[PDB]
């Protein structure tokens, strides 16, 4: 049950939480809740005991992902992780590519333990957020 | 015209013939120099000109041998003057000289202990990489889906230079697992497996991030990628000339 | 009074001529590096070579386009 929070850049933007894919270890879905400066989205996904755990944020079709690693707490008989995404600390080439191309920034989660039976690991797009801002290119991207 | 700087200590030369021989099928005068045994130094220039136009450096644990045959500054001098280079560095043989040269070139390979681990892969035995990760169509344009084999791989980070030429890419779920606790060197499709570099004088270097790629056992899967890789690396595949402007 | 430390080195220009009484000095812009790196890094490499950071550390770059 990890809760990944994208504190904010500005306002709040939106979430398109679409999956449109096959059944790859599906479990409960993300539930959004604005409760503080950090607008936290709580999801309850399965295979909650992984050795490698990362969150890729970007556009896979263009190979511009960014890896975020979570902090694990030992509540006991539980699985909670908090990914703290800062929309003003994101890579320049990513914000500019998100603006130039009207493609949503997808956030995918990966858990795998190096020994689980094949198809017991999770590689699913848990979020798909969009922005509508004024991203200037007067200092253009390397892209 | 071509050198072959191998090291019988780690990976002998015998198991690298299936492609080497092919070079001699075309016009290629091959010279050999086993850094592990030889004590003399190589000679790169004739009369302030280039004796050799190509170079190859098979895996080598590192040490004074290649450091003396070809130091970083000598490599950069041989590169600035039009001359092609082919490097390889698995997670077992990372020659510090080659690592520093590359870092000078923007390509940051991974250190000794780090190895690219990647679940969600077709086979548990080794790092099979699908033909979907090819990035340049002017280097090798895949016709039908093929799976390349990397036994012990090693990714590399890259700067945003106009000269660098990505060729392959790591699987999106692949990470560099250090034995000692450290930050993961690469993670996902931001770590490259095969890289190229075209100098401003149209010289070309290519770094293959593994030693199990150009071997003989894996020929069937890799036969058609390695040949075009060598062709591009040796200015025999995609060279352009301008006339009557 | 001027001492040798007061004058930092020139990394982008070469001195091609200086008159007999050092009255007119002619420098020349050097061509950009072939490997496409900053001439300042080339300079610092050739100059401060005896002491380099021999430790391996992730260079903390940005996302490759
Ligand atoms: C080269 O490697 C071989 C092992 O194949 C060994 O006999 C020899 O000690 C090595 N050369 C030197 C100079 O140590």
What secondary structure does DSSP assign to chain B, as a single string? -EEEB-BTTTB-SGGGHHHHHHHHHSS--EEE--TTT--S----BSSSSBS-SB--B------HHHHHHS-HHHHHHHHHSS--EEEE--SS---HHHHHHHHHHTEEE--SS-EEEESS-S-SSSEEEEGGG---TTT---SS--EEEESSB--EEE---SSEEE-----TTEEEE-SSS---S-BGGGSBSEEEEE-TTS-EEEEESBSSSSSSTTHHHHHHHHHHHHHHHTTSSS-------
Contact of B62 with B97, CB cutoff 8 Å: yes
How many angstroms separate the CA atoms of A122 and A112, rounded? 7
DSSP A7: -
Please answer whether residues B200 and B79 qualify as being in contact, where contact means their C-beta atoms are separated by less than 8 angstroms.
no
Backbone φ and ψ of A134, nearest 5°: -115, 90
What does the alpha-carbon distance between residue A83 and residue A3 come to, in Å, rounded to a whole number? 7
Q: Which two tokens stand for residue B201?
A: 């004088």
Alpha carbon B163 to chain centroid distance? Answer: 16
Q: Hey, CA dihedral for B74, B154, B145, A58, is it positive or negative?
A: negative
In this structure, are residues B176 and B185 in contact, taking their beta carbons and an 8 Å threshold? yes
Terminal C-alpha separation, chain A: 36
Chain A with chain B: Cβ pairs closer than 8 A: 31
DSSP C5: G
Tokens at residue A82, please? 């908090």
Instruction: Give the other-Cβ count within 10 Å of B41's Cβ.
Output: 11
What is the DSSP code string of A37-101?
SSEEEE---S----SEEEEEEE-GGGT---EE-PEE---SS---EE-EE-TTSS-HHHHHHHHHS
Instruction: Kindly report the backbone phi and psi dihedral angles of residue C39, in degrees, each rounded to the nearest multiple of 5, phi listed first.
Output: -60, -25
- What are the backbone dihedrals phi and psi of residue B215, each rounded to the nearest 5 degrees, phi first? -75, -175
Q: How far, in Å, is the centroid of ligand 1 from the Cα of B94?
A: 18
Q: Which of B106, B183, B201 sits opposite C34 (nearest CB)?
A: B201
CA B67 / ligand 1 centre spacing (Å): 16
Burial tier of A33 (Cβ tally within 10 Å: 0-12, 13-18, 19+): exposed
- What is the rounded distance in angstroms from the CA atom of residue B156 to the CA atom of residue C13? 34
CA–CA gap between residue C35 and residue B76 (Å, rounded): 9
CA angle, residues A74, A77, A83, in degrees to nearest 5: 50
Closest CA to B223 of B147, B137, B170: B147
Dihedrals φ, ψ of A51, to 5°? -85, -45
Which residue among B15, B33, B37 is best mutated to probe the pocket of ligand 1, counting the most ligand atoms within 8 A of its Cβ? B37
Q: How far is B189 from chain C (nearest CA, A)?
A: 10
Are A105 and A129 in contact by the 8 Å Cβ rule? The answer is yes
Which of B190, B197, B203 is opposite residue C63, by nearest beta carbon?
B190
Given a contact as 3+ CB pairs under 8 Å, which chains touch A? B, C
Q: Resolution for this model in angstroms, one decimal place?
A: 3.0
Distance (Å) from the C-alpha of residue B15 to the closest C-alpha of chain C? 31
State how far the Cα of A40 lies from the Cα of A88, in Å rounded to an integer: 17
Ligand 1 centroid vs B37 CA: distance in angstroms? 6
Q: Are the C-beta atoms of A135 and A92 separated by less than 8 Å?
A: no
Q: What is the spatial distance between Cα B3 and Cα A102, in angstroms, rounded to a whole number?
A: 50
In angstroms, the CA B135 to CA B167 distance is: 5
Instruction: Say if CB B93 and CB B109 are below 8 A apart.
Output: no
Cα–Cα distance measured from residue B196 to residue B102, given in angstroms and rounded to the nearest whole number: 11
- Under DSSP, the state recorded for A27 is -
**Which residues are paired to C25 by β-bridges?**
C18
- Can you tell me the distance from the alpha carbon of A19 to that of B147, in angstroms, rounded to the nearest whole number? 28
What are the backbone angles phi and psi of residue B149, rounded to the nearest 5°?
-115, 130
For ligand 1, whether the C-beta of B121 sits within 6 Å is no
Give the three-class secondary structure for A22.
coil
| Residue B57: how many other CB atoms lie within 10 Å | 25
Phi and psi, residue B25, nearest 5°: -65, -40
Contact criterion met (CB below 8 Å) for B203 and B79: yes
Q: How far apart are CA A123 and CA A117, in angstroms?
A: 14
Residue in A86, A108, A102, A98 with CA at minimum distance from that of residue B189 = A108
Minimal Cα–Cα distance from A142 to chain B, Å?
A: 7
Backbone angles phi, psi at A98, to 5 degrees: -65, -35
CA–CA–CA angle B9, B185, B187 (5° rounding): 120
Chains touching chain B through at least 3 C-beta pairs below 8 angstroms are A, C
Rounded to whole angstroms, how far apart are CA atoms A73 and B17? 54
Report yes or no: B55 and B85 within 8 Å, Cβ to Cβ. yes
Question: Is C63 within 8 Å of A141 when comparing Cβ atoms?
Answer: no
Distance CA B66, CA B64 (A): 6
Query: Which pair of tokens denotes residue A119?
Result: 């198809």
SS (H, E, C) B133-196: HCCCCCCCCCCCCCEEEECCECCEEECCCCCEEECCCCCCCEEEECCCCCCCCCEHHHCECEEE
- Cα–chain-centroid distance for residue A19? 13
Give the ligand 1 atom nearest the CA of B34. Answer: 1
What is the distance in angstroms between the CA of the first residue and the CA of the last residue of chain C?
A: 51
Tokens of B57: 């450096």
> N- to C-terminal Cα distance for chain B?
33
State how far the Cα of B141 lies from the Cα of B155, in Å rounded to an integer: 22
Contacts 24+ apart (CB under 8 A), B124-131: B126/B150, B126/B151, B126/B212, B127/B151, B127/B153, B127/B174, B127/B210, B129/B168, B129/B170, B129/B171, B129/B193, B130/B171
Contact present, B200 and B163 (Cβ < 8 Å): yes
SS3 label, residue A104: coil
The shortest CB-CB distance from A114 to any of B119, B160, B184 is to B119
Task: State the sign of the Cα–Cα–Cα–Cα dihedral A94, A99, A101, A103.
Answer: positive
Q: Which pair of tokens denotes residue A127?
A: 């979020």
């Amino acid at each position: 049950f990890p809760s990944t929070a994208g504190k904010s850049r500005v306002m709040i933007g939106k979430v398109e939480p679409r999956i449109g894919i096959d059944e790859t270890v599906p479990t409960t879905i993300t539930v959004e809740d604005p409760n503080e400066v950090i607008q936290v989205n709580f999801a309850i996904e399965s295979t909650n005991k992984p050795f490698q755990n990362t969150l890729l944020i970007g556009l896979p079709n263009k190979n511009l992902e960014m890896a975020f690693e979570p902090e694990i707490k030992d509540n006991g008989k539980l699985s909670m992780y908090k990914y703290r995404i800062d929309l003003a600390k994101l890579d320049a080439a990513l914000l500019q590519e998100a603006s130039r191309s009207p493609e949503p920034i997808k956030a995918t989660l990966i858990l795998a333990s190096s020994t689980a039976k094949p198809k017991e690991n999770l590689f699913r797009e848990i979020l798909q957020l969009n922005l509508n801002f004024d991203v200037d290119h007067s200092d253009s991207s390397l892209v | 015209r071509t050198l072959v700087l191998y090291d019988q200590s780690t990976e002998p030369l015998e198991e690298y013939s299936v492609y080497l021989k092919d070079l001699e099928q075309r016009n290629y005068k091959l010279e050999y120099l086993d850094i592990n045994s030889t004590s003399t130094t190589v000679d790169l220039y004739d009369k302030e000109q280039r004796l050799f136009d190509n170079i190859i450096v098979f895996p080598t644990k590192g040490g004074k041998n290649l450091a003396r045959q070809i130091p970083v500054k000598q490599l950069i001098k041989f590169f600035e003057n039009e001359g092609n280079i082919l490097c390889m560095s698995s997670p077992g043989a990372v020659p510090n000289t080659i690592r520093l040269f590359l870092n000078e070139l923007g390509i940051y390979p991974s250190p000794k202990g780090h190895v690219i681990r990647d679940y969600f892969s077709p086979s548990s035995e080794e790092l099979v990489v699908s033909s979907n990760h090819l990035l340049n169509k002017y280097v090798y344009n895949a016709r039908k889906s093929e799976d390349f084999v990397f036994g012990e791989s090693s990714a590399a980070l890259l700067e945003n230079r106009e000269q660098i030429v990505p060729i392959l890419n790591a699987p999106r779920t692949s990470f560099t697992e250090s034995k000692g606790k450290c930050n993961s060197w690469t993670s996902g499709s931001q770590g490259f497996l095969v890289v190229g570099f075209q100098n401003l004088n149209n010289a070309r270097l290519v770094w293959i991030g593994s030693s199990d790629f150009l071997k003989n056992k894996n020929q069937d899967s890799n036969q058609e990628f390695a040949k075009e890789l060598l062709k591009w690396t040796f200015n025999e595949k995609s060279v352009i000339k301008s006339v009557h402007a | 009074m001027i001492t040798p430390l007061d004058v930092p080195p020139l990394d982008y220009f070469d001195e091609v001529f200086t008159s007999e009484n050092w009255m007119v000095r002619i420098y020349q812009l050097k061509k950009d590096d072939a490997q496409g790196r900053t001439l300042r890094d080339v300079g610092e490499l050739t100059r401060s070579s005896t002491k380099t950071r021999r430790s391996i550390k992730r260079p903390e770059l940005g996302l490759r386009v």
